[PDB]
Structure 1
Amino acid sequence: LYFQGSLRETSEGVILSVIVAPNARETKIVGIDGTRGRVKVNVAAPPVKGKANKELMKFFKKLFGAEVVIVRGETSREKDLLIKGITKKEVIEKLEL
């Protein structure tokens, strides 16, 4: 039930709602924001030239084994990621690893 506040399953896959902090020591999940319903993700990339977006997508593509696109928030800290062709059950399993 922990990550469920940050996810919903559409016909296309799962929209994972995140809030990023760039120039981190490691790209990783550090928590959840219970009011915003977003996973707190640290991203080990500078927020310039799209590099934090790229690193974020790379991390989740590797985690989920699925294409990940930013559907909203390309220029925001609050980003919605579509994990294409995956179920919510599969995403929860991988986030809980």
Structure 2
Amino acid sequence: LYFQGSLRETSEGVILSVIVAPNARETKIVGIDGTRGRVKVNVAAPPVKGKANKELMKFFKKLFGAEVVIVRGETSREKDLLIKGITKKEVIEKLEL
């Protein structure tokens, strides 16, 4: 039940709610924010020219094997990612790897 506070399944796929920190040593999940209901994601890219957004999407597209788009928070640390055409059960399985 750990990652479930950060995700919900709509007709389109899964909205994965994250909070990023850019300029990290490695793009990876580092935790969960229990109050905000978001996965803490470090992103190994600078927050300029959209590069942290691009790296974030790339990481999750690779993890889930599905298209990932930003649906809210393009210019925020708090970003909502639509994982297209996937189920919550799939997403949880992959986040728990």
TM-score when normalising by structure 2: 1.00
Alpha-carbon distance, 1:55 to partner: 0.0
Q: Structure 1, residues 17-40: CA drift from partner, whole Å, max 9, x if none?
A: 000000000000000000000000
Count of aligned residue pairs for this structure pair: 97
Unmatched 5+ residue regions in structure 1? none
Distance 2:34 2:23 in 1: 23
- After the TM superposition, which segments of 4 or more aligned residues of structure 1 sit over 3 Å from their partners? none
1:38-78 deviation digits (Å, cap 9, x = unpaired): 00000000000000000000000000000000000000000
RMSD value, Cα: 0.1
Distance 1:4 1:73 in 2: 20
Question: Percentage identity across aligned positions?
Answer: 100
User: Partners in 1 of 2:93 and 2:51 — Cα distance?
Assistant: 27
Q: 1:13 deviation in Å?
A: 0.1
Scaled by the length of structure 1, the TM-score of the pair is 1.00
Aligned twin of 1:4: 4
